[PDB]
Amino acid sequence: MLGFLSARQTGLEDPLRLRRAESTRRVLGLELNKDRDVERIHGGGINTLDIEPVEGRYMLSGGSDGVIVLYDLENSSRQSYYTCKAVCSIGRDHPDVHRYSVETVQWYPHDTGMFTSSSFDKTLKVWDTNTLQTADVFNFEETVYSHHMSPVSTKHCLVAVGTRGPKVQLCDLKSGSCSHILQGHRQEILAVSWSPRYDYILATASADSRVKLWDVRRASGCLITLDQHNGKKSQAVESANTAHNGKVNGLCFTSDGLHLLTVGTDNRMRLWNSSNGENTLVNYGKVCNNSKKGLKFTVSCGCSSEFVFVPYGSTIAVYTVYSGEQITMLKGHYKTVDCCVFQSNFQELYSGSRDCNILAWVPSL
Amino acid sequence: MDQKLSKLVEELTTSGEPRLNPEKMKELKKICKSSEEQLSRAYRLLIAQLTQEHAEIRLSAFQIVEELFVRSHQFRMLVVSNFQEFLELTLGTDPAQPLPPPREAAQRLRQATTRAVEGWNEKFGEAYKKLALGYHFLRHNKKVDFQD
Amino acid sequence: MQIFVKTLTGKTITLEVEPSDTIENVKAKIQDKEGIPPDQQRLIFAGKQLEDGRTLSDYNIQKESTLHLVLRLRGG
Amino acid sequence: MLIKVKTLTGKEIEIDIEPTDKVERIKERVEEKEGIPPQQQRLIYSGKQMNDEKTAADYKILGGSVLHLVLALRGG
Amino acid sequence: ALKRIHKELNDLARDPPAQCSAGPVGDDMFHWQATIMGPNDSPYQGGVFFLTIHFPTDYPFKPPKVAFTTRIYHPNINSNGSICLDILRSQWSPALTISKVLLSICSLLCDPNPDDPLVPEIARIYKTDREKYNRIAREWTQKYAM
């Protein structure tokens, strides 16, 4: 690596080159760390994690027992080994704790002061990071598998909420109105996601093997309805254009926002184009999943070749997004993995499982 | 010096005795203290025995493993290297891989491995955080009754 | 000589006892003083059960000492 | 104010301190009236092991606020 | 009720128990921390084991959730520091006050009952060989209590 240092020093290669090459090297050498720990606080499994977007310091986690821990990943100690102490926690003793499993906790974008969560108690609560008090609560008529806030929108603050009804809900964290709904799906909505690039493009995955991108400004259906064979087996859109063969329960736009990775219960990933819904035929091999709710997964940022970290049974699988190769298989858990989140700042990966653990993977050397 | 070791381990495990016959176990202790690669050779012997289909043989292999664990430190590192498979073969956690017969020996294996894992968590848990992970996983995810 | 005992109700009462006296009579004195049955007392001195079949002199108890009274418990 | 530093045996050593004395002062005063040098004390006030740098006003020690003294035979 | 806890706190500050000490940890009077000095003539001699009391919202008529913070060796106390007294779960009595529950715990430190134990692994050692018990408890006290 001294070659990269000298090249950066004499201005040959842009500093971008060393930065990205070193980030890729670190992610390729990713391994579990016994030189770091995250305190065990959840009675049941961990369903979700979301490192804060700005400064990458705090870290929420939605336990399956309704407790929302709020970790602190900065090594405030002096020793090489440390444990990420849990700063706060919405314990069961809290008056407004979630009665059932918390399956999505997300920071309010552009404002770390607040964060949101939602649970099978058919509620979505807007939590205040400082005083830990519900700022706003929206009660739905049915459960809430997954919700997501636009990480790019400075204009609106709508919140797609995929209930187990066929209708996507849009909740407004400004003056409350959950009236706006997006009709067109046929079964439960297991995973939604806003477009990181465009303000108003929402991609919603369902359990009927359909992935649709909605222009929420448009109030006459969806822009696109993803189709496996790119229209080869052309059929009108009444029972066709199925992005999978079984339930599709996970979405993750690539970091640039140009491609919409989807993973479904048919045990395949597919890197769909995000502008016209044309499958790009990246193989990815066979990816194992059998979960019956929102499967979380994330994609690396600031690396030469974009990696994707998909929960694969009880192991994290690391694929290269644009080539489909399998980099490795991080292997440290005791039950199925429910959510892995990438710490972009230092190329660290935190993967909550169903065994109440949150294993923090870090690079070697 | 592998022939006598494979032999002695075979008479220890295949006998099916309720309790470890003492003097040949002491011979195993001495000759396992002799060399480190041969201690790990005994570890492979134990692992190969533990996969084989008989609850009494698995019990003998596990009790030897517990002896070496409480007696050796490099053995603790080596076994925590694959504690996941060790738990799959001892505790029968995976329904797709239960324990062989007989039922009495399997029950004794379950009780003995639960109590040995308790002792290991108390004695070597801090030095081996992966043992702590395994103990926690057994105590909540698998809900193993440690009070039984 | 006499001894102090701190009953359960916050009050404190003084017992006239001798070192040769056995603990059973001590509990009987607690009984006729306030009336909780000989079985239910569990006298504590320096965090020790005062065994029924023993005497104060066994436990190294002197004048102006104090005995603590609680409700009968058990292990778990 | 007066703090009475009662030990295990029940002996209730009297002490006097100003409201701002550092607890090392408290241990030193206990040394004079009881004889145990400050290294071997572990003063426990209301279920908090007092730390050797905190001022007495930190713990809200008032008149007649009983501490507890426990011997640490090693005591460095 | 608070007034019950207030009266307990005052009457404990005035006339403390001998080898016990409990007071609120901060502003919330419902969360006390206590301290059981190891009873004399026991393996726990010279020890200082810190509890952590939690009074419910109906404290007179409902037990407080006391739990050791200092890892104690005992058949009746798990490694997590939780106790299983009958007085504290089933036979709670309002007349029993915190100065009394702490003293009863102190007494039970020396009077375990391996029958129906919360930790059978230690209970077997206690029932079989008490000589080793008094050494393992001693080393745990020395490595946690002092």
Swiss-Prot record, chain A:
<feature type="repeat" description="WD 3">
    <location>
        <begin position="133"/>
        <end position="173"/>
    </location>
</feature>
<dbReference type="GO" id="GO:0043161">
    <property type="term" value="P:proteasome-mediated ubiquitin-dependent protein catabolic process"/>
</dbReference>
<protein>
    <recommendedName>
        <fullName>DNA excision repair protein ERCC-8</fullName>
    </recommendedName>
</protein>
<keyword id="KW-0539">Nucleus</keyword>
<dbReference type="GO" id="GO:0006979">
    <property type="term" value="P:response to oxidative stress"/>
</dbReference>
<dbReference type="GO" id="GO:0051865">
    <property type="term" value="P:protein autoubiquitination"/>
</dbReference>
<dbReference type="GO" id="GO:0006974">
    <property type="term" value="P:DNA damage response"/>
</dbReference>
<keyword id="KW-0677">Repeat</keyword>
<keyword id="KW-0225">Disease variant</keyword>
<dbReference type="GO" id="GO:0090734">
    <property type="term" value="C:site of DNA damage"/>
</dbReference>
<dbReference type="GO" id="GO:0043204">
    <property type="term" value="C:perikaryon"/>
</dbReference>
<dbReference type="InterPro" id="IPR020472">
    <property type="entry name" value="G-protein_beta_WD-40_rep"/>
</dbReference>
From Swiss-Prot, chain B:
<feature type="compositionally biased region" description="Basic and acidic residues">
    <location>
        <begin position="1"/>
        <end position="10"/>
    </location>
</feature>
<feature type="region of interest" description="Disordered">
    <location>
        <begin position="1"/>
        <end position="20"/>
    </location>
</feature>
<comment type="similarity">
    <text>Belongs to the UVSSA family.</text>
</comment>
<feature type="region of interest" description="VHS-like">
    <location>
        <begin position="2"/>
        <end position="145"/>
    </location>
</feature>
<comment type="function">
    <text>Factor involved in transcription-coupled nucleotide excision repair (TC-NER), a mechanism that rapidly removes RNA polymerase II-blocking lesions from the transcribed strand of active genes. Acts as a key adapter that promotes recruitment of factors involved in TC-NER. Facilitates the ubiquitination of the elongating form of RNA polymerase II (RNA pol IIo) at DNA damage sites, thereby promoting RNA pol IIo backtracking and access by the TC-NER machinery to lesion sites.</text>
</comment>
<comment type="subunit">
    <text>Interacts with the elongating form of RNA polymerase II (RNA pol IIo) during transcription stress. Interacts with the TFIIH complex during transcription stress. Interacts with ERCC6. Interacts with ERCC8. Interacts with USP7.</text>
</comment>
<protein>
    <recommendedName>
        <fullName>UV-stimulated scaffold protein A</fullName>
    </recommendedName>
</protein>
From Swiss-Prot, chain C:
<feature type="site" description="Essential for function">
    <location>
        <position position="68"/>
    </location>
</feature>
<feature type="modified residue" description="ADP-ribosylglycine">
    <location>
        <position position="76"/>
    </location>
</feature>
<feature type="domain" description="Ubiquitin-like 1">
    <location>
        <begin position="1"/>
        <end position="76"/>
    </location>
</feature>
<feature type="cross-link" description="Glycyl lysine isopeptide (Lys-Gly) (interchain with G-Cter in ubiquitin)">
    <location>
        <position position="33"/>
    </location>
</feature>
<feature type="cross-link" description="Glycyl lysine isopeptide (Lys-Gly) (interchain with G-Cter in ubiquitin)">
    <location>
        <position position="29"/>
    </location>
</feature>
<feature type="cross-link" description="Glycyl lysine isopeptide (Lys-Gly) (interchain with G-Cter in ubiquitin)">
    <location>
        <position position="63"/>
    </location>
</feature>
<protein>
    <recommendedName>
        <fullName>Ubiquitin</fullName>
    </recommendedName>
</protein>
<feature type="modified residue" description="Phosphoserine; by PINK1">
    <location>
        <position position="65"/>
    </location>
</feature>
<feature type="cross-link" description="Glycyl lysine isopeptide (Lys-Gly) (interchain with G-Cter in ubiquitin)">
    <location>
        <position position="11"/>
    </location>
</feature>
<feature type="cross-link" description="Glycyl lysine isopeptide (Lys-Gly) (interchain with G-Cter in ubiquitin)">
    <location>
        <position position="27"/>
    </location>
</feature>
<feature type="cross-link" description="Glycyl lysine isopeptide (Lys-Gly) (interchain with G-Cter in ubiquitin)">
    <location>
        <position position="48"/>
    </location>
</feature>
<feature type="cross-link" description="Glycyl lysine isopeptide (Lys-Gly) (interchain with G-Cter in ubiquitin)">
    <location>
        <position position="6"/>
    </location>
</feature>
UniProtKB/Swiss-Prot annotation, chain D:
<dbReference type="GO" id="GO:0006511">
    <property type="term" value="P:ubiquitin-dependent protein catabolic process"/>
</dbReference>
<keyword id="KW-0007">Acetylation</keyword>
<dbReference type="GO" id="GO:0045116">
    <property type="term" value="P:protein neddylation"/>
</dbReference>
<dbReference type="GO" id="GO:0036211">
    <property type="term" value="P:protein modification process"/>
</dbReference>
<dbReference type="GO" id="GO:0006357">
    <property type="term" value="P:regulation of transcription by RNA polymerase II"/>
</dbReference>
<dbReference type="GO" id="GO:0150052">
    <property type="term" value="P:regulation of postsynapse assembly"/>
</dbReference>
<protein>
    <recommendedName>
        <fullName>Ubiquitin-like protein NEDD8</fullName>
    </recommendedName>
</protein>
<keyword id="KW-0539">Nucleus</keyword>
<dbReference type="InterPro" id="IPR038738">
    <property type="entry name" value="Nedd8-like"/>
</dbReference>
<dbReference type="InterPro" id="IPR029071">
    <property type="entry name" value="Ubiquitin-like_domsf"/>
</dbReference>
<feature type="site" description="Interaction with UBE1C">
    <location>
        <position position="44"/>
    </location>
</feature>
<dbReference type="GO" id="GO:0031625">
    <property type="term" value="F:ubiquitin protein ligase binding"/>
</dbReference>
